[PDB]
Amino acid sequence: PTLADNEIEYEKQIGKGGFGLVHKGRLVKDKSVVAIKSLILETEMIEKFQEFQREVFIMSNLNHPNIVKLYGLMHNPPRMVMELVPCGDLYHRLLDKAHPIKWSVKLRLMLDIALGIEYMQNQNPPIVHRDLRSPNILLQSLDENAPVCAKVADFGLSQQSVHSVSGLLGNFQWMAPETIGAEEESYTEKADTYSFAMILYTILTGEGPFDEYSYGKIKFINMIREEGLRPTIPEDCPPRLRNVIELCWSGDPKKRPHFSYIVKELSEL
Ligand SMILES: COc1cc(C(=O)N2CCOCC2)c(F)cc1Nc1ncc(C(F)(F)F)c(NC2CC2)n1
């Protein structure tokens, strides 16, 4: 949690983010594998700074198997040295239509994500991620017997406050109705629960949430908020899962369940 200047060999670039680049690396002492996130700079630059900083502050206190870990910080640009999750992100995996994820594995993924969010929500005060979407779910392993299959990543937009937070969120297909409207109304970690419903939906169907509809942006947002528009749950969905998704994506945040219930229900599938 103290810096790590050098001691890191770069191996390859694996991604990009809101504030910089992401590379796969090795450590010399152990040679253990790692991921490095750099910060590369009204202003956009301030948002980038704030985001990098926010990820560090939030991640600084977290330790859970289903949460990417922060290992150290670096100072030359600067950088966050984190856990390397080798199977990539969920969004890309789901695009491989020819190789559907095995049902047992889908369940592992759902549970693992729920456990991570449950842990976020049990913090004092609770953490609201605000960016829970498939690109931000990383895959440790697709083996149904692995210790960990999925981890929550990218805490750049995260808040951890005693009160409700606010701020308009884009990526409306993944975000709660109370967070996407033009008037900047307040919300809570119940917003993340809604996003999780959409994560459940994407895993279940292998489809992007709301991809079945086509509307202009204003109409789409109004539909989600004022008409209760939601993705259609397939007929073949197991009843207990259908129930969890429906409750989680309730228009009323108060109706979205506590993760103790969500985790118990998912475990029954
Ligand atoms: C071997 O590790 C990966 C491979 C990929 C991957 O499958 N690639 C295939 C196509 O070229 C780019 C990398 C990936 F997207 C993410 C990987 N791992 C990983 N591990 C940790 C993180 C991090 F920063 F959040 F802590 C992360 N961020 C993703 C890249 C934006 N990615």
CA distance 116 to 90: 15
Single-letter amino acid, residue 109: L
Closest CA to ligand 1's atom 5: 88
Examine domains 1-86 and 87-269 and report if their fold is the same: no
CA distance 3 to 218: 46
- Burial 241-251, CB ≥16 within 10 A → b, else e: bbebbebbbbb
Separation of CA 130 and ligand 1 centre (Å): 20
Count CB atoms within 10 A of the CB of residue 252: 9
Q: Which two tokens stand for residue 197?
A: 């419903």
CA distance 51 to 55: 6
C-alpha distances (whole Å) from 208 to each of 91, 222, 226, 230 are 9, 19, 21, 12
Q: Which two tokens stand for residue 180?
A: 């996407």
ω into 77 cis (within 30 of 0): no
Residue 61: burial class (beta carbons within 10 Å; 0-12, 13-18, 19+) = exposed
C-alpha distances (whole Å) from 185 to each of 160, 163, 190, 232, 265 are 17, 13, 14, 27, 31
Rounded to 5 degrees, what are φ and ψ at 12?
Answer: -170, 160
Which of 96, 65, 83 has the alpha carbon at shortest distance from 14?
A: 83
The domain ranges of the chain are 1-86, 87-269
Check: CB of residue 193 under 8 Å from CB of residue 256: yes
CA distance 110 to 165: 26
Element (H, E) at 33: strand 33-38
Ligand 1 atom closest to residue 82's alpha carbon, by position in its atom list: 26
Check: CB of residue 165 under 8 Å from CB of residue 126: no
- Cα 168 to its chain centre, rounded Å, is 17
CA distance 81 to 236: 42
Separation of CA 180 and ligand 1 centre (Å): 28
Q: How far apart are the first and last CA of the chain?
A: 39
In angstroms and rounded to an integer, the radius of gyration of the C-alpha atoms of the chain is: 19
CA distance 242 to 149: 22
Phi-psi region of 204 (alpha: psi -120 to 50; beta: other; left: phi over 0): alpha
Where is the binding site for ATP, in residues? 14-22, 37
CA distance 15 to 121: 28
The residue to which tokens 């009843």 are assigned? 239
Using DSSP, state whether 76 is helix, strand or coil: coil
State the method. X-ray
Which of 135, 129, 132 has the alpha carbon at shortest distance from 88?
A: 135
Ligand 1 atom closest to residue 16's alpha carbon, by position in its atom list: 31
Phi-psi region of 224 (alpha: psi -120 to 50; beta: other; left: phi over 0): alpha
Count CB atoms within 10 A of the CB of residue 195: 27
Which of 175, 195, 200 has the alpha carbon at shortest distance from 185?
A: 175
CA distance 90 to 210: 17
- Crossing angle of the two packed helices 259-267 and 239-248, in degrees rounded to 10: 160
Check: CB of residue 146 under 8 Å from CB of residue 140: yes
CA distance 246 to 14: 35
Check: CB of residue 228 under 8 Å from CB of residue 250: no
Give the side-chain half-sphere CA count within 13 A for 186.
Answer: 7
Closest CA to ligand 1's atom 21: 84
Q: Which two tokens stand for residue 251?
A: 């228009």
Check: CB of residue 205 under 8 Å from CB of residue 234: yes
Q: What is the 3-state secondary structure (H, E, C) of 163-212?
A: CCECCCCCCCCCCCHHHHCCCCCCECCHHHHHHHHHHHHHHHHCCCCCCC
| Domain 87-269 in this protein, CATH class | mainly alpha
Catalytic positions, please?
Answer: 131
CB under 6 Å to ligand 1: residues?
14-15, 22, 24, 35, 37, 68, 82, 84-86, 88-89, 138, 153-154
| Domain 1-86 in this protein, CATH class | alpha beta
CA distance 212 to 49: 36
